[PDB]
Scaffold this active site. Sequence first.
Site, PDB file in Angstrom:
ATOM      1  N   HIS A 258       5.800  14.171  -4.184  1.00  0.00           N
ATOM      2  CA  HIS A 258       5.301  12.812  -4.174  1.00  0.00           C
ATOM      3  C   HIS A 258       3.788  12.950  -4.278  1.00  0.00           C
ATOM      4  O   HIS A 258       3.140  12.310  -5.103  1.00  0.00           O
ATOM      5  CB  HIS A 258       5.709  12.134  -2.871  1.00  0.00           C
ATOM      6  CG  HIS A 258       5.661  10.643  -2.918  1.00  0.00           C
ATOM      7  ND1 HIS A 258       6.241   9.909  -3.932  1.00  0.00           N
ATOM      8  CD2 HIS A 258       5.117   9.743  -2.064  1.00  0.00           C
ATOM      9  CE1 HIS A 258       6.047   8.623  -3.706  1.00  0.00           C
ATOM     10  NE2 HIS A 258       5.366   8.494  -2.580  1.00  0.00           N
TER      11      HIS A 258
ATOM     12  N   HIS B 143      -1.083   7.081  -8.235  1.00  0.00           N
ATOM     13  CA  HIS B 143       0.244   6.740  -7.745  1.00  0.00           C
ATOM     14  C   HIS B 143       0.743   5.478  -8.448  1.00  0.00           C
ATOM     15  O   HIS B 143       0.307   4.371  -8.137  1.00  0.00           O
ATOM     16  CB  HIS B 143       0.135   6.507  -6.244  1.00  0.00           C
ATOM     17  CG  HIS B 143       1.440   6.343  -5.531  1.00  0.00           C
ATOM     18  ND1 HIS B 143       2.347   5.357  -5.846  1.00  0.00           N
ATOM     19  CD2 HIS B 143       1.953   6.994  -4.460  1.00  0.00           C
ATOM     20  CE1 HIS B 143       3.379   5.429  -5.022  1.00  0.00           C
ATOM     21  NE2 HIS B 143       3.161   6.412  -4.170  1.00  0.00           N
TER      22      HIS B 143
ATOM     23  N   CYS C 124       7.556   2.564  -3.604  1.00  0.00           N
ATOM     24  CA  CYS C 124       7.247   3.701  -4.453  1.00  0.00           C
ATOM     25  C   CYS C 124       8.480   4.464  -5.019  1.00  0.00           C
ATOM     26  O   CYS C 124       8.409   5.058  -6.106  1.00  0.00           O
ATOM     27  CB  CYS C 124       6.311   4.649  -3.696  1.00  0.00           C
ATOM     28  SG  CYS C 124       5.110   3.839  -2.629  1.00  0.00           S
TER      29      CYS C 124
END
Lengths: 69, 1124, 70, 279
Positions: D223, D261, D91
């Site tokens: 995040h 995401h 990520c």
Amino acid sequence: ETPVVFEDVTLHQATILPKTGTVSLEVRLLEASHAFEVSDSNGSLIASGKVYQWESPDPKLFDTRAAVD
Amino acid sequence: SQAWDVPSAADFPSGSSCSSVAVYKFDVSPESPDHYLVDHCIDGRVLFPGTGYLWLTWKTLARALSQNLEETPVVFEDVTLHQATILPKTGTVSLEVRLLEASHAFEVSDSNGSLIASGKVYQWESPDPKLFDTRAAVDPADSTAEFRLSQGDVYKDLRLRGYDYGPFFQLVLESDLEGNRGRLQWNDSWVSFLDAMLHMSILAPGQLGLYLPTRFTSIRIDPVTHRQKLYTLQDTTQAADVVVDRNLNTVVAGGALFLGAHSSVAPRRPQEHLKPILEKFCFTPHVESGCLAGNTALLSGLLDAPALKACVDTALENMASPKMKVVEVLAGDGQLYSRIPALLNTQPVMDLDYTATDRNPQALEAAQAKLEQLHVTQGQWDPANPAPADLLVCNCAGGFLLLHTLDQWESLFAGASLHLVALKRSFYGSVLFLCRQQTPQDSPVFLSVEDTSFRWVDSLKDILADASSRPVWLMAVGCSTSGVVGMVNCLRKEPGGHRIRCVLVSNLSSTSPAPEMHPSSSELQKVLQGDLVMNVYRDGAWGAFRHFPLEQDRPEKQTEHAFVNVLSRGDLSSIRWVCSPLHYALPASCQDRLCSVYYTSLNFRDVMLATGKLSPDSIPGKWLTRDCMLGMEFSGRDASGRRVMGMVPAEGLATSVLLLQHATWEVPSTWTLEEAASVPIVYTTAYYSLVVRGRMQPGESVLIHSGSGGVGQAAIAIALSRGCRVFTTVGSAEKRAYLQARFPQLDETCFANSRDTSFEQHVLRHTAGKGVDLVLNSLAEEKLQASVRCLAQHGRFLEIGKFDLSNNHALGMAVFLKNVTFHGILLDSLFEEGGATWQEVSELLKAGIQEGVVQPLKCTVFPRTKVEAAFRYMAQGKHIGKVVIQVREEEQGPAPRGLPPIALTGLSKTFCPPHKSYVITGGLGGFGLQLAQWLRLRGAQKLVLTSRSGIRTGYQARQVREWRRQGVQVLVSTSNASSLDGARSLITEATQLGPVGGVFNLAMVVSKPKYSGTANLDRVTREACPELDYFVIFSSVSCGRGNAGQANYGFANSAMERICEKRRHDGLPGLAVQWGAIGDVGVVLENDTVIGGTLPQRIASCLEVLDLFLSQPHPVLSSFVLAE
Amino acid sequence: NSLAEEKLQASVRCLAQHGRFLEIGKFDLSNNHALGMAVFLKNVTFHGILLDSLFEEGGATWQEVSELLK
Amino acid sequence: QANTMDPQLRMLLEVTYEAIVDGGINPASLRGTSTGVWVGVSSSDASEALSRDPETLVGYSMIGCQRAMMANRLSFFFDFKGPSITIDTACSSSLLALQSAYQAIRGGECSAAVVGGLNVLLKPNSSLQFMKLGMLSQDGTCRSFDAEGTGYCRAEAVVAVLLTKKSLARRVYATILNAGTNTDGSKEQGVTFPSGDVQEQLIRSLYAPAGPDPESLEYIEAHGTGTKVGDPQELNGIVNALCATRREPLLIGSTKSNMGHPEPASGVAALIKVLLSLE
């Protein structure tokens, strides 16, 4: 969920499970032919016939009647 | 703009490894490497090569084997192809191959999980090269004579039959006339090479129609020896030898050999965008009065029947260029914007500017939904003059003006300096006026054209320097056959004479009392003032020559003779009454056997065929035409007056019919001709099955399926007479009824079901698990399989039904330990070919009848009208006994010796009496040979084909050679018809074979084959051909709208077109045909082009167009297909 | 016929029309092999033949067989 | 050679053009530069897809799928003769690419850079692995911060930004004040466990004594995965490091709640949301 039907199945050789270790059996399926066939590790013919989903499963088939007391 | 390859959901692993399933995706767009496939075109579709599935599968094998194709000498077995795959012009199609590595089985699915192909494949372990040996009879000292078939000759004969193979697949290089030897070209592609092997099989002599593969029995490829067998020509290309052995049914080529490669018939699917334009060619006067007055039948105010185009036409070729700016005032109401965009679009050389102008913006509104499609420039305009220019049109309900109101009119045109070009007066007061307003004339040149020499040609080639001699007029006073009209159309738009105002005047008086043609006087100017391009004259009317559409009705006839046959396999809306070949003639020979029908009955096959469930491939007997093939039972009276009942190999559904000695019986004093008309097939079928073949003895047991049915009832009756245990099965409650009543000896133990497999259980009960002695099966798949199980030991399986057989289903070979015997039973196979075995069957009927055993079945009786319905009825198993068609109310009480008066609406199909001879000049010509074939099929026994050198081609040798083996009498002649002495020689040549009933002039080179020949033959034919049925001549639209570079081809044609109109007037047969581009084998290909703004008619279309024309009144007719 | 697998299959093909297949041999039968059911359009008839089945069942059919020997 | 190109790379080549010209520079002005390219890419799915059928699939698909090409082929067409690099860190990546370039410019090396992030969801097997580790939300959503946080909801994106030295930028969305990365040591609770105690450290290394005043922060983009375990660990260590200060210090939020995401693209996808709003 898959009420099945078999037809003309033949068993050819049978398989001798050894006390230990593993044995492999493969099943292959011809989805239009409705055919099928079971091989062993050695690519031998174990079993063969037709299988498919039974569409109109009629429960009156498994009647355990007949009228002789 | 362009969208690209996005790896898909289903593109990544989704189960686990399987060296035993493969999906292949095929792109056919021109970029794809698998574009080569578009050359496997068939009937107009691109079908995946049956051969391809084998390749796919083969690849697949070696994959699973970790090996490559060239290392895996493969063997196939029992492969079946089920459906074929229709590749679309674009996009992809997916094919999956699955492999059962122990069973050696395989099977090919499509995206839709459908069954495409199945059989066995495996690595061939001991590849024996001696299998592909190519050795001969002996040393043939036979080259430079011989006769072989050229690669071209081959795919020509194929594309005829339906196989539109493209370049990448035309691999047959050369071939023995019989199709037994040859050379196939290597392509570095097995898909092609293999399919070519198939070609060769398909290429039998005398084998017609469309055939794909369906079964192979044992393919066997060994690329190892295939390399060695192959060779290099001088061409530098590669090839090898191929052999066909139809006694062994094996084809071998290089390293591949087929064994038992059965194929089968497919239906040609007419593509109705290639429906040709059928026009008639009547003369039309400029002075048509009293027109109509025949139409039994707003519709009244609106007169669009032919005489609209009659003048639009005149006007249209009256300008140099096929481009015409048309306009129309008062448009919204009198709607001409709907018609003429159709009348011009009809011709193949149009360039249309249409203009639709109305006073308001309002009436031009129902038109936005129309003018859009019609492509018409709309506007605004009111009859007061001001104009915001070739023809103007108007409906009041030096170019041209068409008008239509509902003497005073004829002086309103004298003011605007117009000359009434045309006048169509209707019976109800509707009159049509065409008008051309004339610009002063120039130096009017005049040249007559009657002299045979053609002297006027250096005379007209001189009138091309003259800058602008506006009026140039051709004419002919002598020959009633001058071919000007045609000549003109050719020059009227050839560069030099474009604006030449090429006019014409002709003298065609058709009766001797009809003169009236003198120039330099009164009428020379009446016709010069009208200025019309074309001026002809018949018996007193001044009109030009116009093309009108055809009357369209598939010509019927008043016949005492007709039979009925589905005009298209699978659909019963095209079931019709077809003229029977006894309607064309009846030779004393076949004649004593003649017999008139009162009742004809349907049987199951008549149905299943008219359906398409059963192929014509499973019908015993060798067949000329696999067409007419419906009807086998009937009742009536032979020429004895006597009273009979019988069978017939086919064409039974008819007014009249030819008995078969060995299968006609006398119908008992005590049987209505109705009841009689149900017995033959059914009991014959029953006895052949129970007695002769199954050897059913008294007090044995029998299971007879569908006793409700016709064959059932008979089967039951017979098995009861030798008193056996009956077991019948039945669909409907009410069918239990009927049977129970009729056969009283039936318990309720006798009845089981048929909708089902239940009957196996039921039969195993009251059988004590013992089974039945004989089974008379006529039933589906699982149901047949279940009937086999009701077999007692030693028992017999009587197999009537043909569905399971036809599909080469499997039979469990261990039923044979019950010492059972299995009987395939097709009564068809006997019957015609009337052997001893059959005579036995007949005498079981004869006896059975005289012992009451055999009795009439219930009849459901349809009138000779509702025939269609009669089929759909028998279609649905909703009957008990026979479905029967009544053709003649039977003759009543007191003994009636009769003489029948039947008038019937029978559709016309040309048929050849087998005693008459038919003559075709230019008979070995591509198109001639086909008319030859086609003539034979319609029954011709005697052909005289004319050519200059005689037979020179292999493909010519082949046709003629065969027709003689088929027993057609064929005389190849070197005789020419342009010399009366030669013509008499020819017509005489033919007369030896038998009275001349047909003369077709096809010879072409210019005006000796066509004009002079036609002429002579007209004469000789008159003098000594009293039995002439047809007199036909092949023109071409070259004479029609015109061709640049064939003004000589043009004159010659138009000429024949006169001599035809002669013979017509004189009560004789006559017929010229103006063909467009002729296709499959005409002078063109020797099929996607565009000659003369048209399209090559596929000869097949031509031949059936000829059917239509040959039975028409009019002398001259046109047939061509439209480009765009 | 009294012959193997592919060989029986091949003997079925030498059948003329209306012809008859006399099946003596028992190997292929015993294993319920398959028979191409379209050989039956040739109006062929297929015969499973075990003389055993008669023999002690000393029936009429057998007496016929005996008197062909006699 | 285009139908055998990984669609990431296809639309990367377009966005990074769309990006350069976004900042008033004509791309060509950079041809031949010591300019560089950093790509955050974790999933090259298209690559495997066109690498199975060993007769079907062609050899130059690898010039159009091999990860290195996500940058190497962007460098190729634009003529950027400076560093061409792909990074993979799950990520993080794209953000760490943006860090890596900033640093290269900062200290001489380059005058400008292409920072890119890419993630395309083609093979379902991938998601299936994630779900079996429980990190995928059945709910199919990123409950950024909220308590109803099951897991996150994977989404795709190609994004790119152009860094440059101010003395060369015709337009400036913002200026980079600092950036750095560390790595959750060895946690007892497993490898997937977000160590907030370590994330806390990373956030300090870049402020108070060694960088900007923790008081100047107006907004922090989290995040914000939406993990029942992640969220808390992160937001905790955030304040545990950024908050010795008055007023409502940092208004906080996550783009991942708006859209999903984007995995390795997450970093730069987020930056974009930020810059977008700022304007």
